[PDB]
From a paper:
Long cytosolic double-stranded RNA (dsRNA) is recognized by MDA5. MDA5 cooperatively assembles into helical filaments on uninterrupted RNA duplexes longer than a few hundred base pairs (bp). The helicase consists of two RecA-like domains, Hel1 and Hel2, and an insert domain, Hel2i, all of which form contacts with phosphate and ribose moieties of both RNA strands. The helicase and CTD, linked by a pair of α-helices referred to as the pincer domain, form a ring around the RNA.
To complete our structural picture of the MDA5 ATPase cycle, we determined cryoEM structures of ADP-bound WT MDA5-dsRNA filaments in the presence of magnesium (at a physiological concentration). We obtained two similarly populated structural classes, one with an intermediate helical twist (88˚) and the other with a high twist (92˚), with overall resolutions of 3.9 and 3.35 Å, respectively. In both structures, the density in the nucleotide-binding pocket unambiguously corresponds to ADP (or ADP:Mg2+). The filament structure and helical symmetry are similar to those of nucleotide-free filaments, with the helicase in the semi-closed state, and a 2018 Å2protein-RNA interface area (smaller than the ground and transition states). However, we noticed that density in the map was weak for residues 810–827, to the extent that it was uninterpretable in the (higher-resolution) high-twist structure. This indicates that residues 810–827 are more mobile or disordered in the ADP-bound state. In the ADP-bound state, WT MDA5-RNA filament segments had the same broad distribution of low, intermediate, and high twists as in the nucleotide-free state, with intermediate twists being the most abundant.
Author numbering:
A (entry chain A), B (entry chain A): 307 to 534, 539 to 543, 549 to 644, 668 to 694, 699 to 715, 718 to 809, 828 to 834, 842 to 945, ...
The structure:
Amino acid sequence: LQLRPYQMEVAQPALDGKNIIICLPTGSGKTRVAVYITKDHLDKKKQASESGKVIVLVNKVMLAEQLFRKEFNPYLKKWYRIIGLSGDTQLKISFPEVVKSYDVIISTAQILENSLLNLESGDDDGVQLSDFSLIIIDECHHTNKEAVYNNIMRRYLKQKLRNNDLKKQNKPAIPLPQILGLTASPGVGAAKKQSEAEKHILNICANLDAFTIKTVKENLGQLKHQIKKFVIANPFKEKLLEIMASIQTYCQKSPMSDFGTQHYEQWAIQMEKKAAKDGNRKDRVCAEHLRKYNEALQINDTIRMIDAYSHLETFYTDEKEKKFAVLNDKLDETDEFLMNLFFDNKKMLKKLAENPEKLIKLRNTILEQFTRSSSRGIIFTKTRQSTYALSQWIMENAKFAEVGVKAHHLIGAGHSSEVKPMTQTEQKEVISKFRTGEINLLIATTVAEEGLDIKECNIVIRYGLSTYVLVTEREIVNDFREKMMYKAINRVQNMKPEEYAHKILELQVQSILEKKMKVKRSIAKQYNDNPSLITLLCKNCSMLVCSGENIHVIEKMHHVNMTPEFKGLYIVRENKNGEIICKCGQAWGTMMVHKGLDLPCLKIRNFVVNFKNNSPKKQYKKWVELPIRFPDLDYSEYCL
Amino acid sequence: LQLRPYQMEVAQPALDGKNIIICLPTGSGKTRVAVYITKDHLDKKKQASESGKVIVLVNKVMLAEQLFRKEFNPYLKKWYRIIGLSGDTQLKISFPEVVKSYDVIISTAQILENSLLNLESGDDDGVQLSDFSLIIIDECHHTNKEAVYNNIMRRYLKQKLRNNDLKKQNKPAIPLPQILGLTASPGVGAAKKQSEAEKHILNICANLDAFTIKTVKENLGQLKHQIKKFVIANPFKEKLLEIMASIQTYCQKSPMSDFGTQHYEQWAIQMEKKAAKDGNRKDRVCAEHLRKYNEALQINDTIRMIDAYSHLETFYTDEKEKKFAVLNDKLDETDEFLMNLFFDNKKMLKKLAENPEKLIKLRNTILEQFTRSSSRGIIFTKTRQSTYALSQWIMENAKFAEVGVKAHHLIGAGHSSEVKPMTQTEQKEVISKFRTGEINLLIATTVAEEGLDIKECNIVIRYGLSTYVLVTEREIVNDFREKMMYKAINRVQNMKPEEYAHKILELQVQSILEKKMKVKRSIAKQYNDNPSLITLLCKNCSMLVCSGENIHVIEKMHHVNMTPEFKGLYIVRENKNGEIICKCGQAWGTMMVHKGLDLPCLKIRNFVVNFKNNSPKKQYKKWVELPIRFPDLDYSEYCL
RNA sequence: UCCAUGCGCAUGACG
RNA sequence: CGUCAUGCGCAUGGA
RNA sequence: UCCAUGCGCAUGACG
RNA sequence: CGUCAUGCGCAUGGA
Ligand SMILES: Nc1ncnc2c1ncn2[C@@H]1O[C@H](COP(=O)(O)OP(=O)(O)O)[C@@H](O)[C@H]1O
Ligand SMILES: Nc1ncnc2c1ncn2[C@@H]1O[C@H](COP(=O)(O)OP(=O)(O)O)[C@@H](O)[C@H]1O
Ligand SMILES: [Zn+2]
Ligand SMILES: [Zn+2]
């Protein structure tokens, strides 16, 4: 494995066992350097005939699979054992065993941490930093806060300090391993000065326990050889603002602020809690609606108002279906006022929606772009709904197709925000096509920003965040931060080893003590662990829904209430297991059909608390907040 | 942008580049004139194709936001770049950059000055008056003393004199900009004659470097067209005076003056220092109590004595809680004497408080007022406690409500005087309501006097400071001063340019030299910078509390003492982070829970000094007084 | 290969 | 500390 | 949007 | 120079 020159020197310290960081710009292929380090380290331990383990960590799974596909296996296919361990890829054999085998490991963070947790737990599954003789890391910039990498290294620190004490006062000290670290750039956070930046860097180094930053300040020429702009372009709104003010009047709601910002939203949520802490109507009820309206506003500000019509079409049609289901098996004053207030305008509002708008301006921009140019394309933005809107709206346009441009959307995987997620599989499909050329232009939130191999693209437009385009000042501040961190890197590199040691020791101790304080407060957190002290109520209608003991649990995750005395209440709904809804139409939960039972599960977001102590109403958004505990279900009971 | 006639001529000189002042009465809308000047100036620099910058300054933030909302943007929305820069409104991009962009600037004083300070500092953030080709100012009357406006212009002067010297003895001289200035009225201070007034005016002109005052002495008719009275209305006191004299007897305290004035208070404070310089009891202890009593007196003189009962209820109940906490985890001779001296009367004193009083007289006045009259209302006064008292007392009255009058209070924002402050947000809420009509009558200290848009109000009552009412001679003197400044304006306008120049040059030099003397003395001020030379003692009990080196710092603002040897002392209290209190009940500070630590912060007001040199006790009210310096905290230590 | 659930984390904007 | 948006990782269960 | 802290400034009354 | 009251501005930190 021949090593490029600029890679040679930067690696050189690590071959002496110095636990250093190694930062190199993208495109330099810092992986093959890592292989050189690992292979050399293994050969050194081979010469010593001792336990040579490397446990490489990447935060994302795709990185791990890529490393197992392309870089580590092909180079070390011959000599050593490898395994592309990950959470998703089922591995019949547990981790302690692969620690006893498979000298080399690709892996992913919280798998290792889970195993270490099991060591600290009574699972009897064990692993220690002791067992490894080396660790290798990627994207060290993540190692700042309560991140997984940081949690992994924090345990190692405490052991180091114990070992330092043991050295002075004891013959034996526990072994600890080397720690490499690779990053595209160390990063700088919350810096408006060089000094805060340097402190950040030192924090990172302490977290990694490293001896020094390392860069290539010598062979910059070959690097520049191999490694190689900001362009910037109604009555419907008012029609809706008028209704919002009408509803404030209907509600006596004082915003204290304007329409079309997060501040209005936050006040709406706070009023929603208070009205939930009141069990009143037109107060929480109307906060919910106004949240929808404000979202309609701020998407409208950036999006075709047709999409706001779509948003509220979805919303209000679901409202009709909820009330219609409620009718099956009446309507309140509030709901009638609001719903009719909408429907009286809905049709004309759509007529307004037809009328010509960042989107139109942008089209004028990007169509002009697609004449210059193999065609490649990228887009960024913030929301997942914006991506779909851009995709559909662009599809509707005849000009974009006429140019031959084909476009597809792209978002993450997580199950939040009320959007249809994208699977890992389908992401791979899309990027493979963007390499095939089926789609010329991607639409992405931040997935494409990193990890995914998107490259060779002329245009990278950012809408509201190698030609560069930035539609909508933020580039300037980023440039300033880049300059600031380069200067700080140089400063730290040129520092006294003694002062450097003193500085990092102090930061290490600070981190450890802060964790200990965290643990003290955390242990103090949960104290009650009560079986039944409460009542769950519908939050629109401050109505009794459940008690505390009638509840039960499954999977030690989900909470459901049998005892069909409860079942006499709710209503069921579904369109396209099924969904539960209130006698007032308030959404309650899902009919989880599992374990041979149609368990009526619910979600604590939508309910409100009343302690037996008569303590004030509370809203949590998650069960785990309260420390009280509910029983696990006994199928012998309810067996029937 | 068409310009009104009386505005036309007054502006005319400035279009020639003369750096003049422009004073116009309120209601003339002098902003649109400023726009005309700026736009014309920009168009002139456009014709020259040179750097056209305007940096408008207002002392208050609200003025800036108003200018960005209403006047500059709408008129110049099209051509030029604008930015409503302020301290509160977070601006991701720093100031030097907005100096490199955003041709037009609204701003606020000390932001600019901070940037200029950074230029003089090593921050590397830079800006100069050079960069700007124009400055615009509002409320120039502020530019008298060490005000921000004055500090800003003082730097410019020195550079001007250097440039004057450079002109005679050098080809190149540094560029300097025009300086406009707008004010409602120039103002006159400490004048009992025309001559002192004229000197004041000249001082203002020199500070602004202006060429001339400008007024409209020609188009007064249209002005008067667009621009358009003094009415004036017990045993409880004695009950308390008797106790005060009883306590003098208990203390051998000789006032040398009477009860119910600042003089008694000031002597009380001086005795408090001396008794702190004695470490004695019944001397500082009783000065504190008598300060409370005298405040009770002078509020009582103007306020319902129920509120004095409230004041001392608060005080003595807190005394009980302090001593009760002290008991947890005894009582002195002094405290028992004083407390029982109070409690023996407290109930009957309240009974007296029920008995009918400026307030009652005033009610008889203002109720009569509210029959004449859309209803609008204003009130002025001095204290913040008076506003609350008026609001609650008026609320309790049935007549004021019966008339339909609704009333709300209003005060500033600052965190001083032991009152609940009012946020900017809530001030906007109130004035918006006073425009809506929810509240008919405001109660205000001086906030309403200016800046805030309060208008169209028939009544403006002043209680102890377009019908005018003045409840309680001061109007006469104000009228005299107004006449005196109008005459002086006319005099200065009609003056020789040569003599005018000579006069202002001399004043400019005087100001500069005075600043240089200030800087010399200031540099001479701090000289010691010692780590630990002292001991901090409780001031009631002359007891050791801290040393000098055991102290540490955070934020380079706050001082806390870890080393729980200290922690063995104090006691904690809270009612409704938390508060620290003495083993004798003397208040010490706050348990600042920050950075993952429950740091026990303290306040130097409440402690007393003892140098290692054995120098006499000292009280400072602020840490910064002493030049000695304490270390910044090292979290590595105390990490645990 | 898809679906549902729970948990933890970071980033950005805001208050 | 709270809100929103975004992305990520882990652990359950099912088709 | 709220909270706590530090700093500087001006005004008025007084001594 | 000191005291009180009032108002303002800036800079930190947190929820
Ligand atoms: N010793 C070497 N000599 C020549 N090229 C190398 C060497 N090591 C790595 N490379 C180049 O680096 C590239 C791999 O970069 P990669 O690791 O994908 O980038 P990143 O560091 O962003 O993951 C390869 O295309 C390869 O040509
Ligand atoms: N050229 C003009 N013609 C007519 N009216 C004008 C002109 N310029 C300003 N105004 C009036 O001045 C008013 C603005 O005054 P404003 O600037 O708020 O007062 P202040 O000077 O106290 O801030 C506006 O209501 C407007 O009618
Ligand atoms: Zn309900
Ligand atoms: Zn004490």
